[PDB]
Structure formats: structure tokens, C-alpha cells
Fold this protein.
Amino acid sequence: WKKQAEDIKKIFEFKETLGTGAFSEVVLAEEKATGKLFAVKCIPKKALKGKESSIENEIAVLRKIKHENIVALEDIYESPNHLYLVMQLVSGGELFDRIVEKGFYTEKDASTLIRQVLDAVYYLHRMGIVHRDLKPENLLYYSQDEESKIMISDFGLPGYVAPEVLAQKPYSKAVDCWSIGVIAYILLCGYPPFYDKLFEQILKAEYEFDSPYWDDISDSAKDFIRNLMEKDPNKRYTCEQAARHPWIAGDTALNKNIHESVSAQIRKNFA
Ligand SMILES: CC(C)c1cc(Nc2nc(N3CCC[C@H](N)C3)ncc2C(N)=O)cc(C(C)C)n1
């Protein structure tokens, strides 16, 4: 299944860096043979010393599985000193940019986005993957199209982080469900639920649906968010429980244009 390369540059022309990490870089690459674009995750094998085999076994599972709402793993190249995970390039644009650029945006739009994220995350959890890094930067549109799905653009083999992680307590898949709750909060008002003391507010899950920003938001949406942004990970909704909530599965999401306020808050609260 793994392709071998003496030099990855025989296969790909590398262009702009999309993301950097601990001994991992995602770069825009053109396949020389075809002209097709990809997002290539470049990993030094030295950084995988001890776990190489386990990570390869897990890559070997995921290369066979495409989720509608997750970046596809298209190929894996092995050079003498690197692994290259050739990922689907998700090119439709960024999450907050779309909302700001739209003239019209409703709770049903936010609910449609969260439903897709819950589907993707439920799948990762079944495969034994805790994402741990769910935030708007990892959510990109497939296409510039009106009807484009959203996709988790990247995953690994403070304001978005669960209280139990900040508490240095044991944590589980539930940390992702907290992050989806925080993203849902921002999608409905345009600002983060925690900011200052900040650490203490997250630790105590101290947030509010403050006026006027939350006045025209449904009680159902507020209840949905309360069930995900729940301090106790045992009490917190799973992805499965969230996907059954009427705001996702039913018809409680409102059809009021809340674009003006959400777009103003996104512009004011982010760089
Ligand atoms: C936001 C910007 C850096 C960006 C990201 C793009 N794609 C991806 N980006 C990234 N990263 C950057 C965001 C955070 C993430 N952990 C790493 N990773 C994957 C993709 C992808 N699958 O296309 C594609 C594009 C364009 C070139 C289509 N721009």
C-alpha cells in the first residue's frame, strides 16, 4: 500500500506551506505526472521512532475509508527518512470567511454545519481517534458552491479545550464534544464563550447567552449548546446524543437572518 520514493521531489512540486506543527508540515503540492493538487503532510520518520509501526498500521486502516466530511488520505509515500501523507486538498474556503461573505445566515445554516461535524467526529471516535484540536481553522469547505459541505481538513493519527484537559485530569473522546459545543456557540453569535481568570472560567464552564446577541436565538439552540458545553464529561452529550437533539435532527432551528450581528461580532472578536 505504501509507495516508495528515493526523493519526494520526483513525485511532487511543493508550493506554499498550509500548516506547521511538532515535526510535521502540511504543504500544497502538485503531482508532477498529472497536475493534480494535494495537501501533503511531511513527517520525519525520526519523530516516529518507537511508534512507526503502530502509526503505519493506523494509516493503513484510514487509507481505505472516505468520510464525506473528512479530508481523504489519497496515498502514502515513504522516502528513506520521511513519510508523506497525501491528503485531499480542501479548496472551497474558510468557515468564518463564508459566513462574513454571505448576505444571509440562519440557525438552520449553523445546525447544518454542526450536523456535518458531528457525523465526521462520531466516525473518528468509532475508529478510536480523539481529534483533540477541533476549531474553525480545521473546518474548510469542499467547494465555493452555495451547497458545499464542510470538512475536517486535518487530524492527528485553550478557548476550545475541555475543562478536564485544562485540569490535567484523565480525558476521553468527550473533549471533542465540548469543542463542537464551543464552535456551535461561535456560529450562533460570532464571539467565543470564554475570554478574560479565563482558565478558571473554562474550568468552571462559566459562560452566558448574553443579550442582545442571544435574544433572537431559539431556546432549542441554547439547550443544544448547554448539553455539549457541560463541565462533567460523564453528563456531557456524546456526538450520537447531540445528533439526535431536535436542533440537529428536528425542526427547532430557526430561519431568521442573524447574519448582521454574527458577521459584526466575527469581524470585531477575531484578528
Ligand atoms: C487556511 C489556509 C492555510 C489553507 C488551508 C488549506 N488546506 C488545508 N490546510 C491544512 N492546514 C492548515 C489549517 C490547519 C490545519 N491543521 C493544517 N491542512 C489540510 C488542508 C487540506 N486538507 O487541504 C487550503 C488552502 C488553499 C490553498 C486551498 N488554504
